[PDB]
Design a protein around this ligand. Structure first.
Ligand SMILES: Nc1ncnc2c1ncn2[C@@H]1O[C@H](COP(=O)(O)OP(=O)(O)O)[C@@H](O)[C@H]1O
Ligand SMILES: [Ca+2]
Ligand SMILES: [Ca+2]
Ligand SMILES: [Mg+2]
Lengths: 154, 363
């Protein structure tokens, strides 16, 4: 095939990155994100990105999906910031929640200039990096969750 | 304001509203005209009257080849199925990767100039399926009625140099089943008869785990045979055609194509990606589309990719039960997000820039 004659000729370009960077400017949840070392968490709630209060960080509803931004100083420079972005998928989260969490993880990555490294964290399969984010006994799974944003077609 | 999501497959229209968990309209992407040469029928009703019609598909191998008939399909989707006024609804369309650029240019032109939609976007099908699976990294094998293609995606970006495409999919498999059923003395020839054989294929075919062993099993006794009742009431029997037909996906030389089979194209696509992400792709093969619904296909894919890959490679085939609708569902999710809608083409932008703007907005 001739990529250049095709509908994927503009994938992988500066233009693609520019358009997606602009789109990420229209999400209120990212404003002020990633400005200091620490952990910031949002939950998908009927397609919206909703902050989780710091007092609840580490407690996750099994029925829900989340975005967890870990901001840290890299080895290369103690005064700069680097990022791991984890999206956490509860065992009982619905398809709309997991898909929104995945898409909005990419968007937050875009917002932060591509710098975050992405991690998909399914309940019970969490990475060593994810387990390391929370103090001893800090990671707790809660029963239930918020309702799906999908309308069910009968 | 509710966006429309329309996944125009080569064989089926899947259409509905963003935020629904399934498409509300699913019907054949066909226009029927009198077989004897009121003017035409579309979709389900063409199928219903197929006894007196010749059926034509405006999409072939994922590409619109009859634009007048595709206009009839879209008109039917909006006004007769969904019963909406398109000028009231932002519309998300879809496309297989590696289509010629003019396909989405003309999609854009018709949506704005004929249907007066307020906004639209053309999405890459395989990317929608990946998000429907809740992933940002993986390699999607999407196979519908028209195209089989492999799209590796890393951290939300498709890797265009590694995308693979085979213009061999469900319709070719139906045609091949029609052909090999002649060996039993059955004669399926007409466009209407193609639809009967398509149904036989969907109901009775499967992918053998070991093709040569299965051919031997089929010759040793009738244990694999199945019966099928034709619309006229005649009952036919089919045997090794059940698995010879989808074997073509693994052996395209069954229909005279020199191409790599779907296991080899998947492997080749992964091998075109940077080595450090290949383990993630091998552990996240996501199947998408109706031609991935054969019983046994995931197990066969697992076996064949294991034979090609490094001996310690962890390999996983993800086969969502809803994967006939994964593309549509991914579109329903993304079209429910205001930031994704921010990227859509507005009618004013189309008025000022024309069809070329689709390449600067839709990724
Ligand atoms: N259970 C099944 N087994 C094998 N093939 C199937 C099955 N269900 C549907 N198909 C085939 O999948 C194709 C339609 O699937 P779909 O993903 O809607 O395709 P498209 O998007 O090209 O219209 C047709 O070729 C159809 O015969
Ligand atoms: Ca939930
Ligand atoms: Ca990144
Ligand atoms: Mg399709």
């Amino acid at each position: 095939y001739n990529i250049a004659d095709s509908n994927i000729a503009n994938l992988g370009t500066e233009l693609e990155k520019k358009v997606k960077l602009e789109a990420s400017q229209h999400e209120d949840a990212w404003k002020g994100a990633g400005k200091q070392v620490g952990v910031e968490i949002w939950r998908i709630q009927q397609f919206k990105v909703v902050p989780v209060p710091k007092k609840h960080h580490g407690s996750f509803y099994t029925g829900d999906s989340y975005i967890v931004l870990s901001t840290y100083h890299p080895k290369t420079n103690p005064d700069k910031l680097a990022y791991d972005v984890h999206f956490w998928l509860g065992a009982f989260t619905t398809q709309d929640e997991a898909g929104t969490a995945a898409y909005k993880t990419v968007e937050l990555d875009d917002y932060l200039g591509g710098l975050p490294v992405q991690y998909r964290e399914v309940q019970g399969y969490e990475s060593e990096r994810f387990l390391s984010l929370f103090p001893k006994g800090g990671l707790r799974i809660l029963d239930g969750g918020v309702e799906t944003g999908f309308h069910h077609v009968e | 304001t509710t966006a429309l999501v329309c996944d125009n497959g080569s064989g089926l229209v899947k259409a509905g509203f963003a935020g629904d968990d399934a498409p509300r309209a699913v019907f054949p992407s066909i226009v029927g005209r009198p077989r004897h040469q009121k003017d035409s029928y579309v979709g389900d009703e063409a199928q219903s009257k197929r006894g007196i019609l010749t059926l034509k598909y405006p999409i072939e191998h994922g590409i619109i080849t009859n634009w007048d008939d595709m206009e009839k399909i879209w008109h039917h989707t909006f006004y007769n199925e969904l019963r909406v006024a398109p000028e009231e609804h932002p519309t998300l369309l879809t496309e297989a990767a590696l289509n010629p650029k003019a396909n989405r240019e003309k999609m854009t032109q018709i949506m704005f100039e004929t249907f007066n939609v307020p906004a639209m976007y053309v999405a890459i099908q395989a990317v929608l399926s990946l998000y429907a699976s809740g992933r940002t990294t993986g390699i999607v094998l999407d196979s519908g009625d028209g195209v089989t293609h492999n799209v590796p995606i890393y951290e939300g970006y498709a890797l265009p140099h590694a995308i693979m495409r085979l213009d061999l999919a469900g319709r070719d498999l139906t045609d091949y089943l029609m052909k090999i059923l002649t060996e039993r003395g059955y004669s399926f020839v007409t466009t209407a008869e193609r639809e009967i054989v398509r149904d036989i294929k969907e109901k009775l075919c499967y992918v053998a785990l070991d093709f040569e062993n299965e051919m031997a099993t089929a010759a040793s006794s009738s244990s694999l045979e199945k019966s099928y009742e034709l619309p006229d009431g005649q009952v036919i029997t089919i045997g090794n055609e059940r698995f010879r037909c989808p074997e073509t996906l693994f052996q395209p030389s069954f229909i005279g194509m020199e191409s790599a089979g779907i296991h080899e194209t998947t492997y080749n696509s992964i091998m075109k990606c940077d080595i450090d992400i290949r383990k993630d792709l091998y552990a996240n093969n996501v199947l998408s589309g109706g031609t991935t619904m054969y019983p046994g296909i995931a197990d066969r894919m697992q076996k064949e990719i294991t034979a090609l890959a490094p001996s310690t490679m962890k390999i996983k085939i993800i086969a969502p039960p809803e994967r006939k609708y994964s593309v549509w569902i991914g579109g329903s999710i993304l079209a429910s997000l205001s930031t994704f809608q921010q990227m859509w083409i507005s009618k004013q932008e189309y008025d000022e820039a024309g069809p070329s703007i689709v390449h600067r907005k839709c990724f």
